[PDB]
Subunit: 321 residues, 2 copies
Amino acid sequence: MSFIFIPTVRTLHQAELVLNHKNTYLRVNSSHMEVPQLVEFIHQLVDKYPGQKIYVDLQGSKIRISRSQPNLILTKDQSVELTIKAPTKDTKAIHIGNPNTIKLLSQGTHVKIDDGRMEIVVNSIKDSETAIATVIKGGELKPGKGFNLQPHPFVQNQLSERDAEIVEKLKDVKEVCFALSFVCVVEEIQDLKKRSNGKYIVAKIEREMDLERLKAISSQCNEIWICRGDMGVQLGFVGMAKFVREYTTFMKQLNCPSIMAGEVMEHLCDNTIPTRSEICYLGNLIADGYNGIVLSDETVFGKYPQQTMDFCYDFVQQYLN
Amino acid sequence: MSFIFIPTVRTLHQAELVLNHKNTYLRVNSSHMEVPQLVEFIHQLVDKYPGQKIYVDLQGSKIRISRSQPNLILTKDQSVELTIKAPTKDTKAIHIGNPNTIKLLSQGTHVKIDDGRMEIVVNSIKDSETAIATVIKGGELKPGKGFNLQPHPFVQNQLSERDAEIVEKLKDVKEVCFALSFVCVVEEIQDLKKRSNGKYIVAKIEREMDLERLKAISSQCNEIWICRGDMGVQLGFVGMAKFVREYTTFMKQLNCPSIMAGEVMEHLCDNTIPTRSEICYLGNLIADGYNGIVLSDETVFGKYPQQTMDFCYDFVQQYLN
């Protein structure tokens, strides 16, 4: 078997529950803990599991509402300010966490907020920190929610100060691999290769991209994850379904392994049996030639991390014979 | 759009919640109510919805533990009697509902009971009503649980007295179509065509079958359902996943439409959003050329019957354009 499994963990205990099998490598979401805690956790894991690669998932280009954003009622048709400034008391603006965000906006850009529970259209750029938008769909704005642009330009996002720091503080741990969220261009991989001293890099594909772009990216990175979580908001459900299928048809043209991610086995977070579509879909992705799966919520949040991991392994093994 | 939707209902209210859209035809599970109630329900529906075909699902060849079976502790390695006799007080036997069952058993036949929670191997046939078996996996035997044979021979099952009655009492309602559970051979379709006066017939495929068998069946029936519920127990999860994929590769050779069934959208029984694998799998089954889906539990038991139906319709429509 060359197929692999990437279960997500955030404790030592979890790691022990999912590491029963070969071809299995931990993912750690660097959103899940503060940088010092991440560094200590990785150091513990590599002491316990020497030489075993660990995928450290960088939140990368992902855009969110600021964590210090005060709750705000946005009303349909109101004008509103979008800004990368830090939140202040009595702000009436939408405050974005990623400071590269203004440069990604243009007149006409739609932004889905909180998976589409709210929607705005950008009217103009006011200054380097601020855009003016119109609310299309209103509701209560909360800290930390998603913020997805349509269209989203294909430009180099520089790493965030936090991700740059993570890379700097982990580049001396031989086992660490980095997964870069929301890759758009090859230059983002090249930058991360340079900063990490040549480490193994995963490009996380969370949007529609043509084959030629992906060929370029695939010649610089070491692995590709198809990340259906955020792809679903970015593209909508039909657009996601279509693009993952199109990707499957041309992935063999890429020079790296392709790993399926995002709710591969979501029904196993809470339930004891996967659904018949989950099961059929996992068989089909083996036969279509995917090289592995990522387990996220199913292991890191789920009530059955060990059983989920063991089910997946047992299913694939039997499938291949 | 020629794709169709077959939601399952058991009340007038449910039927109203799922009939918002074109290309949508009710399924009624004839297990769900007594024959007189079924007959009255169908009469109500066709008064309300004249000329609209209704799929009446016959439980067919399905084998279950008797409903009058007293609870019984089966112990690993015990000998036990399997019988088609009615249950009696103090029976120590496993009592089967379908009286054709003895003829389907042979020395060496395994039977999974209650989806595999218990397992037996048949040692011999004792008499026309009774086989002797050894328990492989024990537990508490309860009325009404499933009973799946491996191997299951390809023979004509005659209809049950109950199904024969249903057919007789419904054959004069022009809208009724019959779905026959667990089809194995063309003769079962021919018989049901004769008894129903030529009605539209669905062969329910709930087992692995070669293409040539299915070509024969498909030339006599009007539609095929791939029924992943019972197929999953019959074949196991890997065997199901493999066979549905193999079926998809040759279904275009069959002369009738192919409809996907069994947990197409199971996560929507209890949850508000389908999983990313549910969504991708539904897109792929459209692109692979399935001609529709059956919704079972999702509409007849689910908390969101209307929303589930409307999601599916809206997804397919957008997919096709």
